């Protein structure tokens, strides 16, 4: 009862806000993997099968929408198990949504022992190879062997270069433990072959460790209609992708990157770009090859930045270094200086605000695969500099995987949540919350977050300044690490500092729509306290990634009651779709939020 006083005390609010958890009705609940905010104000919410065995069994696939103002919520109908899917807001101002999962089973074998598939290719033309079970695969870069339990039938190369033919086979480790796990993509040796056949014979196979997925991609694609409230079907990708990124380019089309193909392979590069005119998809000339959700971001010279940071999957030295990407011309250029480049896997990006500045921060993370490693640190690169470089900014005090980060009206970023180790293993949740303010370059400590999320969380900033934070996908119940996890359905809201002051500007006249380069006007009784004006494009959050947030500095004038704004002219910085737009004042404390559409 103590504590509960403190933190609910006027002076303690105004300090570091206050948290809220949220629960809904049991017919409502699900599993929330990804979320948005609409142009409605209200959340789309989507789970598909939440990462849960029975649903994909059953093809449950769930979406809610959520009204945080009402409190009220409804279900969608959804088409595909979109659990993995990517998804950005076009320019229409509906959210494309592409990619996910087939059904996917358990692994049967041994829990105690590393192990998952392995594909094994055939380059010979002339015939097929059949591998018997108990054969040996030993890493060329890892060194570690796994045992397949079945034969495998591996059939001939097509000749078209020769495409190589293709088996899948469970393998694991001859001895318990995660001293014989590995983290990343190897290359295989196939024990007891020789001559032709050790030529034309290895696997290739994603981590093999002891939390044993086969995830596999597919193509189905939407655009998820905000009014409506349904996902409207499209045309599909022509490859199938669990886990890609879609991202907007400076011609208003999304580049879809990356993802797990309709075998569970790592997608070799081949990226393809969604015209939202003709609602079709075009493969990209040349190829680039990402790990899975990595974290791609529009620059204002329309070249893309990779900050690093991603999902995981794919080999330890492809795909990796954090850089500046010419789509069109496929050039890409590393931005030296990252700290801690081995702990990219599950760190959050941030644009900073304003996004004018072009700079990026990298948050947290963890090593490759299932690693105990996690980083405390952050990391900085600004864009504009003459050699651009990441420096290390302020840092966490604990090593932080999944850290949630949403940009504020006021120009802070608040970053909460995450966890020390891998999908919160040794009930290593850390309950804690930070403002960072990019002016000063500093964190500060805020009021902590009453639930923890690791693993599929995320959050997103609302229309009234509030925040709410979602999901948590423990894989262990307990601390000892013996009983299966069990998804978090709550939801939580968190108030900021700036809602416990004196009173917000008012602001009316939207829905406006303002072209790049025009302005609008609205009305302010508190016009004359203006200090700043963001346009703040919603958020698409999943696996620590969120693309589609930013926040754009307006120029304004105030003359009494009236502020008029003017959209800066850049397509590259300004995307077209659906913006929220808040005035802040002296005192740091912003209004509600009008909506402006850019064409």
Known sequence: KYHQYKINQPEYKAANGKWEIIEFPEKYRQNTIHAALLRTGKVLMVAGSGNNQDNSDDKQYDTRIWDPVKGTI?????????????????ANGNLLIAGGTKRYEKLKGDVTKAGGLMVVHNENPDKPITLPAGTKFTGKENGKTFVSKDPVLVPRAEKVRNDPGLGRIYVEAQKSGSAYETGTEDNYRVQGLSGADARNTYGIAQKLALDKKDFQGIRDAFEFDPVAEKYIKVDPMHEARAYPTLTTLGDGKILSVSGLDDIGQLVPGKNEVYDPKTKAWTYTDKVRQFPTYPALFLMQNGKIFYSGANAGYGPDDVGRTPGVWDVETNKFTKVPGMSDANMLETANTVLLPPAQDEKYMVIGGGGVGESKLSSEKTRIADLKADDPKFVDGPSLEKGTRYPQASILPDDSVLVSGGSQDYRGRGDSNILQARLYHPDTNEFERVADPLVGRNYHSGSILLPDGRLMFFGSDSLYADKANTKPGKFEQRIEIYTPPYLYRDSRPDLSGGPQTIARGGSGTFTSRAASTVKKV???????????????????????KADGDKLTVTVPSGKNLVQSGWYMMFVTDGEGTPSKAEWVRVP
């Open 74 to 90: 409804k279900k969608v109908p959804t088409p595909s198990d979109l659990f993995c899917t990517g998804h950005t807001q076009l």
């Open 534 to 556: 963001r346009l703040i494009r919603p958020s698409a959050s999943t696996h620590v990634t969120d693309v589609d947030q930013r926040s754009i500095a307006l120029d304004f």
